[PDB]
Amino acid sequence: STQDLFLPFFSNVTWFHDNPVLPFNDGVYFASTEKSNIIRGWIFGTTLDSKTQSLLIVNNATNVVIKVCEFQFCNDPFLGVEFRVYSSANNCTFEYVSNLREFVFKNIDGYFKIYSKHTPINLVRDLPQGFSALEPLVDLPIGINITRFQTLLAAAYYVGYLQPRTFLLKYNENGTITDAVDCALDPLSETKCTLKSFTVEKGIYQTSNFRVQPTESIVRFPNITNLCPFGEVFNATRFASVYAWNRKRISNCVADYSVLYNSASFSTFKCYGVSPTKLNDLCFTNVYADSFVIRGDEVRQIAPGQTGKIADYNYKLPDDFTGCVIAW
Amino acid sequence: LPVSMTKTSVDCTMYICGDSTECSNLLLQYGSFCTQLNRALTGIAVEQDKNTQEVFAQVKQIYKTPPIKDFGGFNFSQILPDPSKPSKRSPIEDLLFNKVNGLTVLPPLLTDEMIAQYTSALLAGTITSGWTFGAGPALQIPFPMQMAYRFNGIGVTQNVLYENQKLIANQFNSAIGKIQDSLSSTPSALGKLQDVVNQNAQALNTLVKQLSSNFGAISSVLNDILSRLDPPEAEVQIDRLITGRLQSLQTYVTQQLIRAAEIRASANLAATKMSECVLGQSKRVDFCGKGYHLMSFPQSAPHGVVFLH
Amino acid sequence: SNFGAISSVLNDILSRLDPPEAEVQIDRLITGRLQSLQTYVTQQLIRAAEIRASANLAATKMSECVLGQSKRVDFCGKGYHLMSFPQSAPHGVVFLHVTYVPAQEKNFTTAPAICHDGKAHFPREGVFVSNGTHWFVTQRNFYEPQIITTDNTFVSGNCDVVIGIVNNTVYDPLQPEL
Amino acid sequence: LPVSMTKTSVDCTMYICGDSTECSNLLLQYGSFCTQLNRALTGIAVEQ
Amino acid sequence: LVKNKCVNFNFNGLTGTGVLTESNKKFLPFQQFGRDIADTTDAVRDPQTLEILDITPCSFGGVSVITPGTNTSNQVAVLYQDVNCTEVNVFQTRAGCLIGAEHVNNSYECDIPIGAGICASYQTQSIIAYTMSLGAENSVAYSNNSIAIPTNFTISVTTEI
Amino acid sequence: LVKNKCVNFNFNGLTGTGVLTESNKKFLPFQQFGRDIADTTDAVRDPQT
Ligand SMILES: *[C@@H]1O[C@H](CO)[C@@H](O)[C@H](O)[C@H]1NC(C)=O
Ligand SMILES: *[C@@H]1O[C@H](CO)[C@@H](O)[C@H](O)[C@H]1NC(C)=O
Ligand SMILES: *[C@@H]1O[C@H](CO)[C@@H](O)[C@H](O)[C@H]1NC(C)=O
Ligand SMILES: *[C@@H]1O[C@H](CO)[C@@H](O)[C@H](O)[C@H]1NC(C)=O
Ligand SMILES: *[C@@H]1O[C@H](CO)[C@@H](O)[C@H](O)[C@H]1NC(C)=O
Ligand SMILES: *[C@@H]1O[C@H](CO)[C@@H](O)[C@H](O)[C@H]1NC(C)=O
Ligand SMILES: *[C@@H]1O[C@H](CO)[C@@H](O)[C@H](O)[C@H]1NC(C)=O
Ligand SMILES: *[C@@H]1O[C@H](CO)[C@@H](O)[C@H](O)[C@H]1NC(C)=O
């Protein structure tokens, strides 16, 4: 059993028959059901606008070629039943030369693993209800951020998208894969994975754990009482002289600094060492407040490192004071 | 004898980690203990319901006693189930029932009434068939003779029984009642069972009580530990907390196993006992009751069994 | 699993970590692995003791249902026991329990004694049975009806106590000859 | 046949902490471990 | 406030996951919150509307897949371990919420164990479930005079292993 | 290449010790090395032959 990237069973795949740009969800699945071979190309990259690295491929009858350049992508590129899917080939980064054909792509760990498997054309109007495996063809070491892809022809096919699931793979008697099971498809199937067995005997089997997740948070609190008496510090009618600065100890009460945020009456609202937003939500021993009047130009002096007369001879703060200050 | 025990079951994580992915993410690094731990309890769980079947499903096909209970003069009305009780139980065992956050508790596979119901049939075949049903197609033999054979099984010629049938009868009926109050009288009668449940409760309550210690870490509520401490430093704190919490659980499990096996040892003993003493008449003196043995009478009980030799 | 260590390999952690700092890192694998080992032991030991208990059973059982004929019902498997046959299997033994089981019966009516000469009778080893007309007494685990004689039964007490003892004849081998 | 092993008893703490109040006061952080340990030993002894 | 839902909470001192409800407990008035015998938060008084709230953890359990042998059918049933189905056809049982199962009244011998005497089997055509049979009943005709003596017999052999 | 002897090896990156014998096994052309069902390296293909 391995958990890796795959197309989950019984996915619901897009069918074409006019080849627009299609993105790359997490992996690239593609397989063309036609003996006409007209569809013989792919485009890779993120911008796809000649400004970013990209990858190109042409599946000739006998001349297979792979390219990594910044082609001037023809916005409507094609060929004829005339191979010019682009307008210029500049700043090339890499080059290589090499009835139902399936091609799985992944740009993984900076590498580009491309996997193939050819099966006959025995279907009429449906993607066959059969099973087989994909055999690796080429792993390419190209460091490209790829978001979308587009197929290049001169029919019909199917394209889905790889997914991060977990599988069990019955390796055969000689190193091939004859069958596999999705872990996460259905109850029955999920049994096989945990039992790590390909065929379950009759009975009962614990598989996983059924737990209910918390759908929401919640918190409640007593009706918030005893607001700290702040109006008589800010809205207070009269103030003392600076050397007669009053210290108002703040006792056990609740602060609610929310007002000093949303009230620009004061001009500074300046806090030191603590952000304004992260102090209306804290707890401390107690609080001491200095309400007084200084000069209109004594605004800067109320800080550590200020050492004026107001600082030194009238009102001093420690060099490491933890609090705030407002002058208006 | 005890027969089963509370099918406890605790998950790996929801014990160690109360759904705190941080705690879980650290836990996964201890490998696969809990699965091993969890599997152990799982087997303990399965072994339990296995015990009861091994001790009660000794009869493939159920029996019923007849409507008219004419037994040569034997009043088993104390032990046969009574219709009057809505639990279809019997007076004796009726006394017996009267006399007795991260985890889970599984119910027993067998419902207690079926537990009684096997005992129900078990009596009938013992009562109205003799040992024969234990070996195959049950055969009905009028009960007085069934005594005679058992008397014949004790080097006691058949003559004595019918000679003294009434006195033989009245003694047995008289004996029966003395059990009923004897269980009622002795407060330490069923201690054997009474201890077991009392022990397991002491185990689990021990297990949870451990959940509130600090184990060389700052505190025992990991969420506050998650809050009050930054993760990387808290991990070391958590690690200590994980350790003690973990192997504390480890102790619980090892504690459980050995007890369970002891029960199993007791269990089979009962099953052996309920084969040899019940389904037939033994000769292992002082195994099916003190003195030469006659028969038995199983009787269902919480988590356990009671025999009447 | 590295038990919370930096790395899961003792060789790399010696290099990829400084040696004095390695020790504390080393300790974790020790404590981790050691306990992990130890739990395996206890896991084994308990299971071993479990086996030994089982072993003794068979050990007895063979020396019970093979070297003899254990009368213990159900000890040699279902039914009255005849013989057991050991066969060796990997790590364990299988026991063919050749047991005996009655199959088919009929209704019969019983009387727990017989009074013939005003005198009681008890079957020495059988039980009195009725095909409706002629009474019979037979071994108690296979219908093998047999004729009433003095030799096949015995006598104790008279006919005033036994419940349901039934008026009937009893034969004497001697009288027809003499 | 053996019949009974030597009735053995070991204190919670006297073993771990040979009478050092600084020790046990650090131990009581460990929940009810030891008290359980005595029980099993005591359980063994009475069993014996 | 939230009731009756798997919610993450804190009442002024104590965290915890749970599903709350208005209990009928009457604490003593000075007290806020209640705790169970095993030292666990079992109740809190909502300090706004001073109701007594019962804490119950989010209902959960294991899951085991009902199945006949894959050999038989791919159609299965699922057991969710003891949650009220409304908390998840469906046939509730004392052993849990057992989806993909149709109960049947007719007594049937147990085939697969679930709990509380609940066993199942394939039928005709899906998976059923039922309170299990007590075993097949077989009454016997006792009398004070009816004796049953066997006439033929078989020497079985079984393999205790 | 050295066979039938206790040696150390590294085949295109496959590190490890042991002894090398001509395995009767059959790989697939693209593959490089087999593994034990219990996840232990079991065989390799010599790039030489
Ligand atoms: C595929 O998608 C269509 C529409 O999105 C939906 O009707 C159909 O049921 C899907 N098939 C499956 C197998 O889910
Ligand atoms: C077994 O190996 C042979 C070649 O040795 C190959 O042809 C055959 O396909 C293998 N078996 C399977 C089931 O793939
Ligand atoms: C809290 O406020 C609510 C608002 O309606 C009120 O009904 C309740 O009585 C108050 N309780 C306290 C303790 O303040
Ligand atoms: C004996 O007679 C009773 C009553 O008629 C009947 O129920 C029972 O089946 C009979 N036994 C046999 C073996 O036929
Ligand atoms: C058996 O019981 C019936 C019930 O009426 C009774 O008539 C009969 O006498 C009893 N048997 C004997 C031997 O007395
Ligand atoms: C299991 O499958 C096999 C086919 O290989 C079949 O012969 C057998 O009857 C099946 N048994 C059950 C119980 O489904
Ligand atoms: C499940 O929900 C129903 C809804 O009416 C309720 O009556 C029942 O009591 C619930 N189950 C339990 C075990 O309480
Ligand atoms: C069983 O019978 C009861 C009584 O009518 C009924 O309520 C219940 O739905 C029945 N169930 C089935 C499966 O027939």
Numbering used by the authors:
A (entry chain A): 50 to 66, 80 to 143, 156 to 172, 188 to 243, 263 to 436
B (entry chain B): 727 to 826, 856 to 1064
C (entry chain A): 968 to 1145
D (entry chain C): 727 to 774
E (entry chain A): 533 to 620, 641 to 676, 690 to 726
F (entry chain C): 533 to 581
Which text from the study accompanies this structure?
Many efforts to develop therapies against severe acute respiratory syndrome coronavirus 2 (SARS-CoV-2) are focused on the interaction between the spike protein, which decorates the surface of the virus, and its host receptor, human angiotensin-converting enzyme 2 (hACE2). Linsky et al. describe a de novo design strategy that allowed them to engineer decoy proteins that bind to the spike protein by replicating the hACE2 interface. To address these challenges, we have developed a computational protein design strategy that enables the rapid and accurate design of hyperstable de novo protein “decoys” that replicate the protein receptor interface to which a virus binds to infect a cell. The S protein RBD attaches to the cell by binding to hACE2, a membrane-associated protein, triggering protease-mediated fusion with the cell membrane.
CTC-445 is a 160–amino acid protein comprising 18 of the natural amino acids; it does not contain cysteine or tryptophan residues. The computationally derived model of CTC-445.2 closely matched the cryo-EM–determined structure [Cα root mean square deviation (RMSD) = 1.1 Å], with minor differences observed in the N-terminal EE3 and H2 helix. As designed, the binding interface of the SARS-CoV-2 RBD with CTC-445.2 closely mirrored the target hACE2 interface. We used site saturation mutagenesis (SSM) to explore the effect of single–amino acid substitutions in CTC-445.2 on its binding to the SARS-CoV-2 RBD. The experiment showed that mutations in the core of the design are disallowed, and mutations in surface or exposed residues are generally tolerated. The SSM experiment also revealed that there is room to further improve the affinity of the protein by introducing mutations in the binding interface, although doing so would break the hACE2 structural mirroring of the de novo decoy. We also performed an SSM experiment for the SARS-CoV-2 RBD binding interface to compare the effect of single–amino acid substitution on binding to hACE2 or CTC-445.2. Although CTC-445.2 was resilient to viral mutations in the RBD-binding interface, we observed some decoy-binding–weakening mutations that had a lesser effect on hACE2 binding. Therefore, viral mutational escape might still be possible if multiple (decoy-binding–weakening) RBD mutations are combined.
